[PDB]
Symmetry: C3
Subunit: 202 residues, 3 copies
């Protein structure tokens, strides 16, 4: 289910905020601007409450998941609250096993070939590449040869200026954080439109 | 292998879409002066390719396997005559198998922590991958804390940067697409250029 | 205590050298130039001798530690010789445990988010980022989002040109090797003065 969605939409909003109220406002803005894939990070206070209270956005077509998951306890709260996918900055075998038990899509984050192979051995072929800015599109191109079956979602410093370079390198989708989600809701809505249009343009 | 890497300085990392293409490129490269030939397991029937190139060993070619990601692949490569095993990552299971089998294994590493784990498994010659991400800078940085580790970078090594890599302190380089892509004739020629450029530094 | 000393002093001299006498010459030079945090690496011959012999600087306010610690054996010798902190290029769980037991500050080095999370699970929030020149201040900015409580001390290529960029990126302190330590004692002392001024400035 999830693979096809990331393939279709090509962008996930990585939602960081300092309150439940701010996170909800930003999720709503990104969605109004055309971003349907929305990751509520666990750096948001009461992130699980946010996910539960965004059920109304799901009714409209939004796909709400959880990010910055660094423990199975957070993963469980995320899933119980309605998360449709789980993302972490790192590779975590425990979270991977939890998500399989629940039948929930997990996208671990990797930065190295060894992390990549460990993730692939746990059944993962769609990987978050984090921090993408640091390793660059070059990393994605380098992985093509040895790992033709693996697809990346680079996250970390993705912005309007570098988004097309990532798609030129062969990426499945991008995770956009601060370049998308910072600002007044009107600003965020218009940044969401800018990103959707930028991607449709590469 | 240590001494072979030291002497030859270049390993062709051979990716190809067929057995026939892989064999023709391995011959091209050898004819152009590259003695260390790594048949990656992304080559279809990479097993068969290594076995069918076994005769080149009699001409002094050293045929190994690359992109080895499981012990099952490792077994097939060794069974078919691979003289060395290379992977993009550090694999404890492949390390152990190659230790018992008495075959040289060069794991790939990208970080100081990965490097240290590989050293603890008995390795001091490491594939650095992807070289284009981490660069000569990484090789120079490792000389401080780990003076006795030596790297063989794979990834983006080309005619313009091969000498910088050797300036940074690498033991040999692994060259893929810059060497191996194109037709047999183009590959044999690019092989010659790399040997001369490397000798030239 | 070390967290507080890092924040106060902001720069650690990372001493590599080919002899005891060279290491001591460089330590004195850097100290006379106002760098109080001094890391003797275990690539210095008889580095534990260097640590013991520099003990007199401690009454002057120097804080002397050991770096390039790659085994518990070296860690035990360093602490025995008077090392007040321990640093490694990598994350070593055995060293972390030993240092925990002995009650000595340990700063493991990490280069990836997966290594970072493992180090956090071992109790570390202050991390060496190595090699700094490969991941850059962009790694430090990228980590602020998911790991807002983690503080970095980059080592690798920090120099007078980029030192303020690392601090502007959010680093707690910097580890400086050859940009600081290379040269005649007189040269090293003036570079130490230069680094302390430049850091105070930004």
């Amino acid at each position: 289910k999830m693979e096809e969605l990331f393939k279709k939409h090509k962008i996930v909003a990585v939602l960081r905020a300092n309150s439940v109220e701010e996170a909800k406002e930003k999720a709503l803005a990104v969605f109004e601007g055309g971003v349907h894939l929305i990751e509520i990070t666990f750096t948001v206070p009461d992130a699980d409450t946010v996910i539960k209270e965004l059920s109304f956005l799901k009714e409209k077509g939004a796909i709400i998941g959880a990010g910055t998951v660094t423990s199975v306890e957070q993963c469980r709260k995320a899933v119980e609250s309605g998360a449709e996918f789980i993302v972490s900055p790192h590779l975590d075998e425990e979270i991977s096993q939890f998500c399989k038990e629940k039948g929930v899509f997990y996208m671990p984050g990797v930065m190295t070939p060894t992390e990549l192979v460990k993730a692939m051995k746990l059944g993962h072929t769609i990987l978050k590449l984090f921090p993408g800015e640091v390793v660059g599109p070059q990393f994605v191109k380098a992985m093509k040869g040895p790992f033709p079956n693996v697809k990346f979602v680079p996250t970390g410093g993705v912005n309007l200026d570098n988004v097309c370079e990532w798609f030129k390198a062969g990426v499945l989708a991008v995770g956009v954080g601060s370049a998308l989600v910072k600002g007044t809701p009107d600003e965020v809505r218009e940044k969401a439109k800018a990103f959707v249009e930028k991607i449709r343009g590469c």
